[PDB]
Subunit: 115 residues, 4 copies
C-alpha cells in the first residue's frame, strides 16, 4: 500500500474518525483531477487508497476535510481543509504515509517515506 | 495590518528568511486570483501584505514556497509548497504562523481584534 | 501493551531509530524512580515497555534522549532531552501511546489514549 | 531581554493568557533550583523573566503549568505540565525565545535563538 494517511485529533487524544480524504493528481492541462478518496476509519487511517500499479510518477495533493470533522463535533475551526502537495515516485519507488495532527486553529503534516 | 505571516525554521531555530509567500482570493468564477505577494524578511515576517481597505470578506489561500526555501539551503524536502486556506468573515486581524522542517510543516492561526 | 511510543524525525521523513527512552514513576517521597527503558526500533517504536500488571495508577515521565539522537547524526540540537509527564490509570484502565516529532530546535508530542 | 516565552492556544487561535511559568536552573548538587517565574500576559508572553546579568551559562528548565490552564477553561488535559530543558550561553551570549503551542492532548515547542550581535 504505497499511499497511507494517519490522522490524529489533538483535542481528544484519539485518532480522527470519519475525516473525508481526497487525493488529486496534477494533469498536463495544469488542473487537479480526482485520483482517490476515502474516510478515515476507527484508527484515523485510510485502507486501500491506491495501488503500486495505478500510482506512478507525478504531483499529488492529499486533502483532509477538517472543517466538516470539527463542525460535526460542534467546534468552529479556522481552516477550510488541510492539503499536502508533493511530487511522488520520481527518484525510485517509495511508500508515503501522510500523518496529520489536527487542532481547531492549527495543523501539522508530516511525511514518512520508506523503501 | 490585517494579514501577517510569521515563518520559523525548526532546523536552525531562526526565523525563515526569503520564503516566497503568495496570497490568493477565491472569485465568483471559482478560481484563485493572486491578491498579495512577498518574501519573508529577517524575522520571517512579511510587512504590509495587504490593508484593511483591500482585505474584505471571502476565501483566502496563503501559499508558502517551501521547496525553494529548502533547495536553496541544499536540502531536498517533501512538500512542493504549503497552503493555508480559510474564510475571513471579518473586524479581525489574522497571523498565519508556519514552522518549517524538511518533511514536516506546521501551521497555526492567531486571530485578534 | 499499555504504554507505547512512536518517534518520527521531521528532518529525514523517517521513524527515529535508536532514541533512548526512559520511563520514570513518581514515588511517595516525591522523587522520580526509574520504571522502564528502551531504544526505538526501525519504526521508531518501543515494543513492550511495560505490562498491564506492572503499570498502575500514578504520575509517569517518559524521557526521550534527543541530544544523543541528533549529535549521532552530526546535528547540534537545542534541547537536552524531551519529557512527557502525565497521570495514568486514575479514571479506569487505559492504553497510552506517546507520539513525538523531532526537529533540531523543535519538539512536538501527542498522546493517543484508548480503552 | 534574554529569555522570553510565547504561548499559544491551538483550540482558540489566541495567545494563552495566565499560564503559570517557572524557570529552574541546575546546580552543582544536581538539583533544580527555582530561577524565575511569571504568568503569561494578554499576548501569551512573559517579558522581564530575567536579565543578561542574572542569566549565565548553565542548564535551564522552563515549565508551563498546562493542567491549570486547561482545567480553568473546563478542559481535562493529558499532561501535568510541559518542560523545556536546554543548555544556555555556553558558546557565546544568545537570546532565547521558547514558543509553546498548547492543545489538551498535545504540546509543541520551538526555540528561537538569536545573536544580539
Ligand atoms: Zn511498493
Ligand atoms: Zn488549488
Ligand atoms: Zn490492558
Ligand atoms: Zn525533573
Ligand atoms: Zn543579551
Amino acid at each position: 500500500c504505497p499511499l497511507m494517511v494517519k490522522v490524529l485529533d489533538a483535542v481528544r487524544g484519539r485518532p480522527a474518525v470519519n475525516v473525508d480524504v481526497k487525493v488529486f493528481k496534477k494533469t498536463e492541462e495544469q488542473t487537479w483531477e480526482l485520483f482517490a478518496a476515502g474516510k478515515t476509519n476507527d484508527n484515523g487511517e485510510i485502507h486501500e487508497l491506491t495501488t503500486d500499479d495505478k500510482f506512478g510518477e507525478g504531483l499529488y495533493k492529499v486533502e483532509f476535510d477538517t472543517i466538516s470533522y470539527w463542525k460535526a463535533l460542534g467546534v468552529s475551526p479556522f481552516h477550510e481543509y488541510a492539503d499536502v502537495v508533493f511530487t511522488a515516485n520520481d527518484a525510485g519507488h517509495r511508500h508515503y504515509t501522510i500523518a496529520a495532527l489536527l487542532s481547531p486553529y492549527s495543523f501539522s503534516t508530516t511525511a514518512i517515506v520508506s523503501n
